[PDB]
Amino acid sequence: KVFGRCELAAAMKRHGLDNYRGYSLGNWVCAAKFESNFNTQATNRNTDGSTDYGILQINSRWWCNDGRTPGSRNLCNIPCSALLSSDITASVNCAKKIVSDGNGMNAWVAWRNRCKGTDVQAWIRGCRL
Ligand SMILES: [Cl-]
Ligand SMILES: [Cl-]
Ligand SMILES: [Cl-]
Ligand SMILES: [Cl-]
Ligand SMILES: [Cl-]
Ligand SMILES: [Cl-]
Ligand SMILES: [Cl-]
Ligand code: NA
């Protein structure tokens, strides 16, 4: 599913991400825009043989099982395919574990490089929330 900006903001708010670990909703919308262009089906292979899945590009080296990342962990206890669902629940629940891990949203390279320190409230401007 390719979400609209406001549609995704509303879905993320309903799933409890607004101000989760102190990160305002615009941070999460900005991260999804630049990680996946709001496409739940986004996948990208990494040099190390891991793969990033879904709207927040969660990596199979640590967070999910794809059966083809040797020596990896599955800290969200989910198949990586669950992260490509039209239903963002599994992505949101795993993202909550990631952002609790110690480096906050710096775990998302696109957030650090394209959202951090910017006017992220712009990403929820106009939306009925
Ligand atoms: Cl947009
Ligand atoms: Cl915000
Ligand atoms: Cl594996
Ligand atoms: Cl594990
Ligand atoms: Cl699995
Ligand atoms: Cl959803
Ligand atoms: Cl933090
Ligand atoms: Na894994």
UniProtKB/Swiss-Prot annotation:
Pfam families noted in UniProt: Lys (PF00062)
Disulfide bonds: 6-127, 30-115, 64-80, 76-94
Keyword set, alphabetical order: Allergen, Antimicrobial, Bacteriolytic enzyme, Disulfide bond, Glycosidase, Hydrolase, Secreted, Signal
EC number: 3.2.1.17
UniProt keyword Secreted, yes or no: yes
Domain C-type lysozyme residues, every copy: 1-129
Molecular-function annotations in GO: beta-N-acetylglucosaminidase activity; identical protein binding; lysozyme activity
Tissue specificity note: In the egg white and polymorphonuclear leukocytes.
Single GO BP term: killing of cells of another organism
Reactions catalysed, as given in the entry: Hydrolysis of (1->4)-beta-linkages between N-acetylmuramic acid and N-acetyl-D-glucosamine residues in a peptidoglycan and between N-acetyl-D-glucosamine residues in chitodextrins
GO cellular component: cytoplasm; endoplasmic reticulum; extracellular space
Active site (catalytic residues): 35, 52
Subcellular localization(s) per the UniProt record: Secreted
Residues given in the record as substrate binding sites: 101
Enzyme superclass (EC): hydrolase
Top-level taxon of the source organism: Eukaryota
Record function comment: Lysozymes have primarily a bacteriolytic function; those in tissues and body fluids are associated with the monocyte-macrophage system and enhance the activity of immunoagents. Has bacteriolytic activity against M.luteus.
Additional remarks: Lysozyme C is capable of both hydrolysis and transglycosylation; it also shows a slight esterase activity. It acts rapidly on both peptide-substituted and unsubstituted peptidoglycan, and slowly on chitin oligosaccharides.
Subunit structure: Monomer.
Entry similarity comment: Belongs to the glycosyl hydrolase 22 family.
Protein name in the entry: Lysozyme C
UniProt source species: Gallus gallus
Gene: LYZ
